[PDB]
Amino acid sequence: APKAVLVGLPGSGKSTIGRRLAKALGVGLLDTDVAIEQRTGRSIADIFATDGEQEFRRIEEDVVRAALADHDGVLSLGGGAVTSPGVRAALAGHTVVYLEISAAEGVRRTGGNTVRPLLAGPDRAEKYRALMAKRAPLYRRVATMRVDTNRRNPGAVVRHILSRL
């Protein structure tokens, strides 16, 4: 079973905080978005364009159930994984950390285009605020620890978590 599992919106810090926490405990990192590209032929934007979001979600669920059984290090999840009811039932019993961020700082952190099919195009600030309103009740229901990332630098986030494990 993992030592910790990380969830939240794009730009909260899931990949950055996960690398740094794994180095301090002595263990490996597994990132489910990276695992998906390795197993199929292609990119995340390629699968969304040829096949659709509902077929992305079925591949993501099967990857997640297997990681929770076989991996003893730190695990980082994709941003919309909590919208599947089969993902929420596999998480019950596990150690789960929710990273919180405001809408104005969150949109400024995503600013140098990694891509992101669901944030693409004009009116970026309007689309980010609509994603927050519908997911926030879902992050609160799955969590066992909540941490505020608004005025904490990344080394100080790591130390707050380490003392509560």
Ligand SMILES: Nc1ncnc2c1ncn2[C@@H]1O[C@H](COP(=O)(O)OP(=O)(O)NP(=O)(O)O)[C@@H](O)[C@H]1O
């Ligand atoms: N506490 C922090 N303070 C200052 N900058 C930060 C903080 N956390 C993350 N960043 C920066 O914000 C950017 C995004 O962080 P990242 O770790 O990629 O988040 P993400 O939650 O994994 N995205 P996704 O899987 O696509 O939903 C990076 O350049 C980081 O360097």
Ligand SMILES: O=C(O)C1=C[C@@H](O)[C@H](O)[C@H](O)C1
């Ligand atoms: O639905 C989402 O919010 C996301 C889906 C994919 O682009 C990626 O899995 C990303 O982390 C965000």
